[PDB]
Amino acid sequence: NSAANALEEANSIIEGKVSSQLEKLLEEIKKDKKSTLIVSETKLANAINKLGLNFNVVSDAVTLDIYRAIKEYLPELLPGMSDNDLSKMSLGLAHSIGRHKLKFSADKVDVMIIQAIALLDDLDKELNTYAMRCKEWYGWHFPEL
Amino acid sequence: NPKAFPLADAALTQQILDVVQQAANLRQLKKGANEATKTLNRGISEFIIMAADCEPIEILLHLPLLCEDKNVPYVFVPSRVALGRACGVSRPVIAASITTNDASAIKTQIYAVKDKIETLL
Amino acid sequence: XXXXXXXXXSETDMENVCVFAQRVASLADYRRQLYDYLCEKMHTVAPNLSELIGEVIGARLISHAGSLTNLSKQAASTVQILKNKGRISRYLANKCSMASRIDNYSEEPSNVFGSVLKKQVEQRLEFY
Amino acid sequence: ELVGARLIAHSGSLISLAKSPASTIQILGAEKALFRALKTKHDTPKYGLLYHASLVGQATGKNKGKIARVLAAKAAVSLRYDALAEDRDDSGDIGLE
Amino acid sequence: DSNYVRTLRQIELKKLEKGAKQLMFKSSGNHTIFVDSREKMNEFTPEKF
Amino acid sequence: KVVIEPHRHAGVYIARGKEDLLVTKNMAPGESVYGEKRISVKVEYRVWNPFRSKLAAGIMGGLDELFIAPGKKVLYLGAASGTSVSHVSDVVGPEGVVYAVEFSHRPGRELISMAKKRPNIIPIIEDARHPQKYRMLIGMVDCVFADVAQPDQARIIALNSHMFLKDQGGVVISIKANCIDSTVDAETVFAREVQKLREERIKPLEQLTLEPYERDHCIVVGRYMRSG
Amino acid sequence: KQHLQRETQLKQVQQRMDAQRELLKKGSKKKIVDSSGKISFKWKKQRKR
RNA sequence: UUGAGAGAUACAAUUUGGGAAGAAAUUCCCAGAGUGUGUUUCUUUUGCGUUUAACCUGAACAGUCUCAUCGUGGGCAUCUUGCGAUUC
RNA sequence: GAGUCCCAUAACCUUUGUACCCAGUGAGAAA
RNA sequence: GCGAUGAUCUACCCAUGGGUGGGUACAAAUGGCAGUCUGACAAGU
């Protein structure tokens, strides 16, 4: 699921843990216990073996070329599931973990504040010239007020 | 991880507070956090000496941001009051700034302490 | 594009936009209401000027003169309004003068002469 | 909140205001009165944009300049605490003291 | 007197770095190209490469 | 008025008016991101000047094969506050996504706020010594340029380029001798660094001294073969 | 170049009254004299309260 | 006064190489390098004599009282003719 | 120590995108 | 089958096609004029 909170939770889990979608994918693809899988990181390889897999989990072996074959078919073999050009969804993902790894409290936008004052000063002159227009218009009927 | 970038040890703070003692003896050093910003914008700074135990430590953290654009050197000494006494003034100084003077008699000291805090960065 | 958004983001900002955008909506509702008051009150006051030229052009003519009587006080040549621009502009500049004449110096002016003067500028435009 | 907004609107970004020293904050409003007087060898203004601050309005005469120095130098300290904070409690306790 | 002189000095300093912004400085560095064989080492000519 | 001239490298131009400048076609119209001048000649442009961009000194000194191309993906190693990442976005167009990595928070706030405007750049805020920590994002970037100033420049390339780079790809790295040794000759430092890159399955093509803009700096380009 | 030669002339001008302005303040002044004739001022080591 | 190393190179030696015209040789735009004689800057190899130097520092300007700074007056145009600097 | 508002919350110039075309006369027209 | 209830007057060229000659309202400008004041004493006895 490409949810905003979930993919940020999945990316941090894919850096130091075993994700919920990865555990669900491991259970659905658990054909036989004598299966050898090469993980991306060596730490994720040990965590996959430590969790409920009971299979062979390989460390950072010569399968980096298999990772290259995975990323060369990342636009190609993705069409088995869904043919997509992943530029846009990686863009939304990378800004999401960047906004989350940074603290980035949303009130820290001073560009919003500076033209809010410029909107506030324009409100003062527009209300002044409208009050003067209502001053003489009713002053036609009632000049003393 | 720490408050800022480098904190001078026991040995470096001898020579870095020997020069600012001789600079104040010469009356060339400029003192204070706001006056250290003044000589940075002028571009007549030699190096900036901040303190590592300010209350709070944030109020002189603006100076490293004004440091790594004109590449002026900057260190941290572990006491405001020790920096305040090498400055030659009865009040604690959190940020001291040596000004450049080519016709100065502290020349061999002031370029010695320049290059060993280039290594400290 | 509503189901496929592609922009940035909060809550107090989002409340401030809709309060500001309600202010835009209340201003344009009031301006359109003032416009509907403008084309009916002046058409009561100066009907022959409203019939001859238009509701928005005659109203700017009164505001540029400063009063309705100063359109009638001025000559038909010195009034400036905003081969056709060399002839029909000066011919109309006469016509808005006598339309301002017949809308000022009566009490309750009828719109028959505005329609009559409309037929005169209709025949002149066909002559062009 | 209204005087401090006019400082941010004058300086631009929040971080560029913290990089301004205490004197720059004090004479942040009257650039016209300052740079004219600097180029003709006259006296600089002493208030700038800080005349509409509440504490400056409490002082009288010569005391208005003396407060505006202390207020802007404390505001420079307060702004440098603000523009770089990671452990900010959003209560402004350093501003209050 | 000190304020006026530094104001002219900072005017000329800011116009210097503004004057360095749109100016062009030609580079003459040690542009060196590595080679893998001695036969290509002595037959090299930049017009050929 | 201004006579225009495209460079040997595609996508970057030289504006030869009465004054002379190195200039790039804009992608964001009507927006400068650190106060830079421009020439509209129509298409609005944007200028470079090598005194803060270490890639621009490599362009201006004369680079034989700039592997940054107007349709190729670029890995920006060491994105110092977007001062040149915005420039390489203008030179590769909207075709290949340019990746920027960084550690510190002050460039990180400037990168994210400027990558909001620019959809070419995606910023990564994670350590560049751990390519597995952002392995979920990149597959064979078409070239990598490095501008890191941490003294394992050869390792931080060999960690990243061994599994994020296309075979027969190009690797660019900015190395300065003041970071790494600062007490010997600069040429022996760069001689040490090219044999450092030679051990990492990288054939070094060209090294250039960046003399009139950045003292004691360098740009190394070269090919990278047969892994990842 | 005229920007630079005006700026470094204004720097030497500013330093010559800035040493003069700091000469007037307080402290025990002492006029040292170089063997080449270049005068300066070295001060006492008194901590000003 | 040595042992080499690294260059800006001053004169010459056919070349090396892209372009043009040279039907046949030339020769031009040039880009350099290599060699000898130069002329050379710096690195080490080298032998003898010499263990002291250089700078800073402590209570280190001042009763012939000194130093600032603003003024004033007179010398030096046969020329410290005087810089926001110090002519005496 | 020390000139805010006399407006650097602006003024003027320059460079882009837009709109527009260079009062007054008085008797002539048309064929 | 005229008119004073206003007749007429108030740039180069593609054998009628647009810039240029240009001058004005305003929308902007991370364009300029344009560089952000001193820096250790004061107040009480």
Which residues have C-beta within 8 Å of that of residue F83, sequence separation ≥ 6? Answer: F34, F52, F53
For the CA atoms of C37, C43, C45, C49, the dihedral, rounded to the nearest 10 degrees, stands at: 130
Q: How many angstroms separate the CA atoms of B64 and B95, rounded?
A: 11
> How far is F170 from chain B, CA to nearest CA, in Å?
30
Q: Is F178 on the interface with B (CB under 8 A)?
A: yes
Please report which residue ranges of chain F form alpha helices under DSSP H: 54-61, 85-92, 105-115, 153-164, 177-180, 186-198
- How far CA D64 is from CA of D34, D51, D57, D58, F65, in Å, comes to 18, 8, 7, 8, 65
DSSP class of B21: H
Q: Whole-angstrom Cα distance, residue B119 to residue C8? A: 43
Q: Is the peptide bond before B56 cis (omega within 30 degrees of 0)?
A: yes
User: Would you say F138 and F94 are in contact if contact means Cβ atoms under 8 Å apart?
Assistant: no
A58 and A45 in contact (C-beta within 8 Å)?
Answer: yes
What interhelical angle do F186-198 and F153-164 show, nearest 10? 30
Instruction: Give yes or no for a contact between A75 and A86, defined as CB atoms under 8 angstroms apart.
Output: yes
Q: How far is the CA of E15 from the C1' of H71 (A)?
A: 40
Chain D nearest-CA residue for A119: D9
CB of D73 within 8 A of CB of D12? Answer: no
Q: Look-up: residue for tokens 């953290």?
A: B61
Q: Do residues F15 and F21 make contact, with C-beta atoms less than 8 angstroms apart?
A: yes
What chains are in contact with G, requiring at least 3 Cβ pairs below 8 Å?
A: B, E
Q: Rounded CA gap, G24 and B111, in Å?
A: 29
φ/ψ of C81, rounded to 5, equals: -115, 160
Helices (H), ranges, chain A: 4-16, 20-28, 42-50, 64-72, 87-101, 110-139
Nearest residue to B69 (alpha-carbon basis) of F32, D22, D19, F182: D19
> How many interchain CB pairs under 8 A, E with G?
26
User: Which residues are CB-neighbours of E10 under 8 A, at least 6 positions away?
Assistant: B42
- Cα–Cα nearest to F208, from E26, E27, E42: E27
Helix and strand counts by DSSP (H, E) for chain E: 2, 1
Enumerate residues 6+ apart whose C-beta is below 8 A from C33: none
A4 DSSP 8-state letter:
H
Could you give the maximum distance between any two Cα atoms of chain F, in Å? 51
CA-nearest of F74, D9, C79 to F66 is: F74
Assess whether D69 (CB) lies less than 7 A from strand J.
yes
What is the Cα A7 distance to its own chain's centre?
6
One-letter amino acid identity for C93? A
Contact between F210 and E27 using a beta-carbon 8 Å cutoff? yes
CA-nearest of A59, A109, E21, D92 to F48 is: E21
CB E46 within 8 A of CB G37: no
Within 10 angstroms of residue F108's Cβ, the number of other Cβ atoms is 20
A7 touches A14 (CB < 8 A): no
Backbone angles phi, psi at A19, to 5 degrees: -75, 165
Contacts (Cβ under 8 Å, ≥6 apart) of D3: D49, D50, D52, D53, D54
Identify the residue whose tokens are 């979920």. F136
- Distance between CA atoms of D17 and C123, rounded to whole angstroms? 70
Nearest to A6 by CA among A14, B98, E10, A54: A14
Tokens of D58: 């409490």
Q: Quick one: tokens of F218?
A: 């360098």
Task: Say how far apart CA C68 and CA F16 lie, in whole Å.
Answer: 62
Residues of B in contact with F104 (CB under 8 A): none
d(CA A79, CA A73): 9
Write the burial class of residue E16 (CB in 10 Å: 0-12 exposed, 13-18 middle, 19+ buried): middle
**Rg of the Cα atoms in chain D:** 14
What is the layout of strands, in order, in the sheet containing B95-99? Answer: B30-31, B95-99, B45-51, B74-77
Q: What is the number of residues in chain B?
A: 121
Three-state secondary structure of G1-49 = CHHHHHHHHHHHHHHHHHHHHHCCCCCCCCEEECCCCCEEECCCCCCEC
Distance in angstroms: CA B120, C1' H52? 35
Facing residues of G48 across strands?
Answer: B89
- Residue for token digits 């993980």? A39
b/e map of F69-93 (b: 16 or more CB within 10 Å)? beebbbbbbbbbbbbbbbbbbbbbb
User: Both tokens of residue G19?
Assistant: 């040493």
Q: Which residues 28-47 in chain G have a CB closer than 7 A to strand H? A: 28-31, 37-39, 44-45
Strand F3-6 versus strand F12-16 pairing type: antiparallel
Rounded CA separation D67/D58 (Å): 9
Bridge partners (DSSP) listed for residue B74: B48
Spacing of C59 CA from I22 C1' in Å:
27
Alpha carbon C65 to chain centroid distance? 14
Please give the Cα distance from A110 to A49 (Å, whole number). 49
Contacts of A124 (CB under 8 A, 6+ apart): none
Helix, strand, coil % (nearest 5) of chain D?
65, 0, 35
Distance of CA F212 to the CA centre of its chain: 19
| Burial class of F216 by CB neighbour count within 10 A (0 to 12, 13 to 18, 19+) | middle
Contact residues on chain E for B69, CB-CB shorter than 8 A = none
| Interior angle at CA F145, CA F141 and CA F148, nearest 5 | 125
Give B22 to chain D, closest Cα distance, Å.
Answer: 26
8 A C-beta contact, residue B89 and residue B29:
no
DSSP for residue F97 = P
Nearest-Cα distance to chain F for B119, in Å, is 8
Instruction: List all residues 6 or more positions away from C46 whose beta carbon is below 8 Å from its beta carbon.
Output: C58, C62, C68, C99, C100, C103, C104, C109
Q: Tell the residue number behind the tokens 């040690």, with chain if given.
A: E30
C90 is near strand I: CB distance < 7 Å: yes
How far are the Cα atoms of A47, A72, B120 from residue E41, in angstroms, in the given order? 53, 37, 43
Give the whole-angstrom CA distance, residue F58 versus residue F81: 19
- Measured distance CA(G49)–CA(B37) in Å, rounded: 24
In chain F, the residue whose alpha carbon lies closest to the alpha carbon of E22 is F21
Tokens of D69: 């120095």
What would the two tokens of residue B108 be?
């061999």
Helix (H, G, I), strand (E, B) or coil at D84: coil
Helix axes B107-120, B12-26, angle to 10 degrees: 140
For chain A, give the longest Cα–Cα distance. Answer: 99
CB-count burial class (<10 Å; 0-12, 13-18, 19+) for A62: exposed
How far is residue F52 CA from its own chain's centroid? 12
Phi, psi of A36 (to 5 degrees): -110, 120
Cβ atoms within 10 Å of B92's Cβ, excluding its own = 17
Q: Nearest-CA neighbor of A120 among G39, D9, F98, C110?
A: D9
Please enumerate in sequence order all residues whose Cβ is within 8 A of that of A61, keeping only pairs 6 or more positions apart, or say none.
A38
| Segment 19-58 of chain F within 8 Å of chain E by CB | 19-22, 37, 47, 49-51, 57
- CA C102, C106, C108: angle at the middle one, nearest 5? 100
Q: How many CB atoms lie within 10 A of CB B3?
A: 14
Half-sphere CA count of F103, side-chain side, radius 13 A: 11
Residues with Cβ within 8 Å of G7's Cβ and at least 6 positions away in sequence, in order, are E9, E12, E13, E16
Nearest to A39 by CA among A66, A69, A75, A10: A66
Q: How many CB atoms lie within 10 A of CB C115?
A: 13
Q: In chain E, which residues have their Cβ closer than 8 Å to the Cβ of B42? A: 6, 10
SS (H, E, C) C58-107: HHHHHHHHCCHHHHHHCCCCCCCCCCHHHHHHHHHHHHHHHHHHHCCCCC
**Is E35 strand, coil or helix?**
coil
What are B81's two structure tokens? 């009051």
* Token pair for G7: 């700026």
The DSSP 8-state label assigned to residue A78 in this structure reads: G
What DSSP assignment string belongs to B81-113? HHHHHHTTBSS--SEEEEEP-SS-TTHHHHHHH
- Round to whole Å and give the CA distance between D36 and G26: 31
Distance CA F79, CA F108 (A): 9
The number of helices, as runs of H, and strands, as runs of E, in chain F is 6, 11
For chain G, what's the residue count? 49
Cβ atoms of residues C82 and C56 within 8 Å: no
- For residue C22, which amino acid is it? Q
Radius of gyration in angstroms for the set of CA atoms belonging to chain G, rounded to a whole number: 15
F62 close to E (CB below 8 A): yes
Residue F208's nearest CA partner among A145, E38, E32, A14 is: E32
Number of separate helices (H) and strands (E) present in chain B = 5, 4
CA C34 to chain CA centroid, nearest Å: 12
> Which run of H or of E encompasses D35?
helix D31-40
Task: Say how far apart CA C48 and CA C70 lie, in whole Å.
Answer: 16
Q: CB–CB of B90 and G49 under 8 A? A: yes
| String of DSSP letters for F191-226 | HHHHHHHHTTTEEEEEEEE-TTTSTT-EEEEEEE-S
G14 and E2 in contact (C-beta within 8 Å)?
A: yes
Residue F15: which H helix or E strand, with range? strand F12-16
